[PDB]
Write a protein that binds this ligand. Structure first.
Ligand SMILES: CCOC(=O)Cc1nn[nH]n1
Ligand SMILES: [Cl-]
Ligand code: NA
Ligand code: NI
Ligand SMILES: [Zn+2]
Length: 329
C-alpha cells in the first residue's frame, strides 16, 4: 500500500497535468496522498489565479469574528464574538497594527512555538466564511468557483437528483487566527488556495486514525462531549501538537504559503493558524470515493452546528435514518 506512514505529500503537477482536476485528485490518491488527510499542490509556474490583488480592498467583511479563548495553552476552546463590519482594506490595517501584528520571529518553527505559547492570551479577529471568489473567470485550471458540484457528483454516482448549490468561501486572516479541529461537513473533501499574504500552518490526523483524536477530545472536553456526541462539528476545540504527542495521537504538520493549494481528504481532521494578514479561498468537493464517508459521517444534532442549505439533501439521501433527528437541530 502506498504511503503507509500517512505522510503529507507535496505534488508539482505540470501544466498539462493541471487541466483535469478530477484526474489529478485520483492520481494523488493512487500515490497514497489521502492517507495523510492533507496534501499540498504547488501549481505549475505557468499558472496564475488572477492578474493582481491590487483591487481587493473594497470587499466587505460583514461579520468579522473575534476569537476569544478559554482553557490552557495546549487545550482550549474559542468562542466567536461578532464585531462591526469592515472592508478588507480596514481589516488589513487592523491586522498590521501593533495590537495584532505578527511578532518578530526567526523562522516558521519559532513562530509556531510563539503561537502555542501565547495564543490564548490574545483575541484575534477573523474574517471567515465570506461567500465569493477571487479567481479570474478566465482561469481555467483549478478555479475553485468552477469545480464540479457535490450535487452533480451524487447524481452521477447514485442517480440521485437533489436541490442545492456549492460555492466558494473567502477568508481574511491575521496573526493567531485559528481554525479548530474538524472534518468537513459530511466528511467531504476540501480544497484551499492561499491567494495572498502570510502563511497558514496546518495540523492533520490521518483518516484511519480519526477516532483516536475523537477519543482524546472527549477526554479533554468532557462537558462538551456530554452535550453533543459530535461536538468537534462545532469547530471550537483546540489541542496543541505537544498534547497530541503526549497522548500518542498520530498527526502531521505543514505550512502553506501564498500561491499553494491544500486538499483535505474525507475524514481527515485538521486545525491550524495564520501567521499574519492573508487571504484564502476554499470549497468542499466530492469524488466517488467520498460517498461511503458521507454515509458514515457523524452529525451534530444538538443545534450548535448550523449548516448550509446544501447539507439537508446529503443527510436526507445518504443518512435517512438519522434525518429526522438531525433536522430537529
Ligand atoms: C470563525 C472561525 O472560522 C474558521 O474556523 C474558518 C476556517 N475554517 N478553516 N479555516 N478557517
Ligand atoms: Cl506572540
Ligand atoms: Na508523521
Ligand atoms: Ni476544513
Ligand atoms: Zn452539537
Amino acid at each position: 500500500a502506498q504511503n503507509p506512514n500517512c505522510n503529507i505529500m507535496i505534488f508539482h503537477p505540470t501544466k498539462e497535468e493541471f487541466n483535469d482536476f478530477d484526474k489529478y485528485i485520483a492520481y494523488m490518491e493512487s500515490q497514497g496522498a489521502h492517507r495523510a488527510g492533507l496534501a499540498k499542490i504547488i501549481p505549475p509556474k505557468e499558472w496564475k489565479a488572477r492578474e493582481t490583488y491590487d483591487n481587493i480592498s473594497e470587499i466587505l467583511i460583514a461579520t468579522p469574528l473575534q476569537q476569544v479563548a478559554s482553557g490552557r495553552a495546549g487545550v482550549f476552546t474559542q468562542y466567536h464574538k461578532k464585531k462591526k463590519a469592515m472592508t478588507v482594506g480596514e481589516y488589513r490595517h487592523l491586522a498590521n497594527s501593533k495590537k495584532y501584528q505578527t511578532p518578530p520571529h526567526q523562522n516558521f518553527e519559532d513562530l509556531e512555538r510563539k503561537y502555542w505559547k501565547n495564543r490564548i492570551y490574545n483575541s484575534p479577529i477573523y474574517g471567515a466564511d465570506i461567500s465569493g471568489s477571487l479567481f479570474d473567470e478566465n482561469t481555467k485550471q483549478w478555479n475553485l468557483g468552477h469545480l464540479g458540484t457535490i450535487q452533480d457528483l451524487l447524481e452521477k454516482e447514485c442517480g440521485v437528483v437533489i436541490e442545492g448549490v456549492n460555492t466558494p468561501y473567502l477568508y481574511f486572516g491575521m496573526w493567531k487566527t485559528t481554525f479548530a479541529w474538524h472534518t468537513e461537513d459530511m466528511d467531504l473533501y476540501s480544497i484551499n488556495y492561499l491567494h495572498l499574504g502570510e502563511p497558514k500552518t496546518w495540523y492533520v490526523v490521518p483518516p484511519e486514525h480519526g477516532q483516536r483524536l475523537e477519543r482524546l477530545a472527549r477526554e479533554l472536553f468532557p462537558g462538551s462531549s456530554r452535550g453533543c456526541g459530535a461536538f468537534l462539528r462545532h469547530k471550537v476545540a483546540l489541542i496543541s501538537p505537544t498534547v497530541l504527542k503526549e497522548n500518542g495521537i498520530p498527526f502531521n504538520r505543514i505550512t502553506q504559503e501564498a500561491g499553494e493549494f491544500m486538499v483535505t481528504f474525507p475524514y481527515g481532521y485538521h486545525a491550524g493558524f495564520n501567521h499574519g494578514f492573508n487571504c484564502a479561498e476554499a470549497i468542499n468537493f466530492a469524488t466517488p470515493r467520498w460517498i461511503d464517508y458521507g454515509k458514515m459521517a457523524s452529525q451534530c444534532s444538538c443545534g450548535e452546528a448550523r449548516v448550509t442549505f446544501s447539507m439537508d439533501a446529503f443527510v436526507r439521501i445518504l443518512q435517512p435514518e438519522r434525518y429526522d433527528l438531525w433536522k430537529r437541530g
